[model samples]
Target: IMPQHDQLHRYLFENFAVRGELVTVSETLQQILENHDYPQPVKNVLAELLVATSLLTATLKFDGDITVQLQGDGPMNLAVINGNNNQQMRGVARVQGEIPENADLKTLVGNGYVVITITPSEGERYQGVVGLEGDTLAADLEDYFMRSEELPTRLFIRTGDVDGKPAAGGMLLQVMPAQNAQQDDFDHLATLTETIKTEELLTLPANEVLWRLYHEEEVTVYDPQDVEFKC
Candidate 1:
């Protein structure tokens, strides 16, 4: 059994200039798609978007909301996930045609784009739009970060089942801004992060996951914040 589900954990590498964010939203994802009769492929896409949005919102420094949306020319025309700095999350998807059970990202979103809108509680709202260039949502989101914020960010999203229920979790690694972080350091850490598996992420505790990934590296983990389904 997992230590807890639907919590976001933040960690910093003491020896590197890169920070990490890990989140598991299995129950939240299950709730978001609970009432929708989405196809397997569509459900998979929504799962990815949900996990992606959760990680994105955790990066916010102020009270606000972030909406990650996808618009496409294929059967699944629109899929969106919205979350706030508090980790309150909600999402939905629309599909207009038959979707294959094994449909992949490109197959579901032919000629598509991703739109990310940030609404700060005190500041003006900002929006960024990027064409879908990566083969998966994780890659596309990485591209979005580079194009919009110029931050070197990497995202790893995983979706599968635990006891026949949908479970999705992901991690993010980004270099701290204005820091003299060496490229090789970030690359080495990211390489270690890339070895994480879906089952391990969904089943293990945050501390265990981190230790499993970077036991040899000095890291500091902060208290976790709970992630919830707000709608």
Candidate 2:
């Protein structure tokens, strides 16, 4: 009984120099996996990318689009997800060979690299590339943030079944720029974020989830944004 349409929630830790975003994408995740006969592992990977893209899109301060793409020599040669600040997303994957039921990230995309392109509605576009250093997309993305942006970022992504349907969601914690935030504080917040459960994120509302996780902190949540599939 989750919302048919995906939604994103953003918040700020007033007392701490950290910003957060929580995203849930069931319908959007479903639509992207449709029309294509992707393997179960591929489906899970795309779901992870969808949730990754959704969380990444919220980091944009400009009016533009972000494309997160991957390419390799595995049966699944290419996979990409695109979205804008409005949370409009459309993604597709290319599968050419057989994929094992237990295919992991490296096994699915052999010798692949992640390409992240950001196009601002006003400024010139930017491009950044990083090798698939992390096994999972989430870890790779976190590595990107740390290496490329030099920001300590933590992503808590969850993907599983909810009422017989696929449900994917995640949370992001990043330190504010130019803030005198201590490293220990960021690590402490990330530690708390890691405690989040998949069921709590998929089944509970955004506010309650925050309250559950950050009840001891001074958190201020902003209005929720509706995220849907736009093609």
Candidate 3:
């Protein structure tokens, strides 16, 4: 069953040749956005990080929390979001300087880098850092995945309003753990999933979005898990 407010949807294809997840946070995102008076660009970035952290938390095989952070010498000094295995999430941003109402990623976060920290309840922690190579949060995250996981992965994130309420959503596609798999096949699937729009993701149900994007492809979706936030 689909979860309301926040949710994590996991799936596999080609008999485990590939695995993917889609996560959306509405109330959690609203809470983060409410704590600060960030400009539109910063708000969007924070929303993206919120979705990314939730997705990362779902990938954790053990009890843990994922921290997704952006730091730089820009108007937005730092932005971060944290999510745990239970899907409880919270985030905040530090801004300094007049963030123009229409600033872009670079303007809001100059010379910035992204850091992903995974803290497991029963094991050592892992951290990965990557330079901001793309103008969008999704692009920067893809760069991190390439450097850390060394596996082809894609993230599509969208933040806006649904029925006049704030919403954030995204999808992730990663090649399954294996020794032999066709890169072309992965790319083909990635390309198809990339076509998803924010409107469709935020408004439509997960199954409907998947069907619309990959109706012709053979895919298997697992049970969805609920995501929430804690103060």
Candidate 4:
């Protein structure tokens, strides 16, 4: 299972032919929601972004932090989440217009783009901007991977009440380098993973989720890592 606070869970298959991470956040989500009285839709996007940023940071092989931001000429000016190698996370959201109680992604963030920035503690920073082509944050991120990294990446994110407590969690799968991994293989795996419901991922043990998703594949789960707040 993933550790307390916010965490990045790493896994590998085919002797590192493919590697990925799954992340979940409760306290961090609460922290972001605590400081801001954002509309429900904005809060939902922030939760997904928080989880995405944590997962993105875990994929970094170097020492650094990741900043994921959403901006546009909408009621919501910006929403950002930042995380580092150690899993420390903090986020905030800014809204300008009267956010209806039932606003969707487009309404809350009209004509905006999502910017992903990676700042290595000791090196130059890299950034990428992706158009908001999808209705959900996860889809936009997948578009980012396709356009920027040119890697086959899939993100399954869930956010809401789990066991009566707020929770956010997700799984990411990316093709390993130079493996010639067929798109079918990645899609097959992604399809099974997509079957996972929010309730199962948020409440079930991590091992159970992985087993349920990839029991037929040669999957090797690693020791869990600690995820905590910055202070």
Candidate with top lDDT is: 1
**Candidate 1 to truth, TM:** 0.95
Instruction: Give each model a TM-score.
Output: 0.95, 0.95, 0.92, 0.92
Runs in model 1 with CA error above 4 Å? 1-3
lDDT of 1 at 40: 88
* lDDT per residue (tens digit) for residues 1-231 in model 2: 554567999998987889999989987888888888778889888888888888888886778889988889988998999888888898989898989988988889969788888998888998878788887788988898888888878888999888987889999999888897787888999999999999999988887898998999988889989778877
* lDDT by residue for model 3 (1-231), tens: 554567779987754387788878876777778856667888788888888887777776868777889989888889998878888888888888878888888778869788888888878998878788877778877777777778777887888998776899989888776646577777888888888898888878888998898777778889988877677
lDDT string for model 4 (1-231, tens) is 334455557888774366667777876677768755667888888888888887877777878788899989779888898877788888888888888788888788869898888888898888889898877788988877887788878888988886665789888898887888877777777887889898888777777788888888888777666555555
Root-mean-square deviation of candidate 4: 2.0
**Pairs with steric clashes in candidate 1:** none
Model 1 worst lDDT run, 10 consecutive residues: 1-10
Q: Considering only N, C-alpha and C atoms within 3 Å, which residue pairs clash in candidate 4?
A: none
Order the numbered candidates by lDDT, best leading: 1, 2, 3, 4
**Once model 2 is optimally superposed onto the true structure by TM-score, how far is the C-alpha of residue 123 displaced, in angstroms?**
2.2
Q: Model 1 shows how many backbone clashes?
A: 0
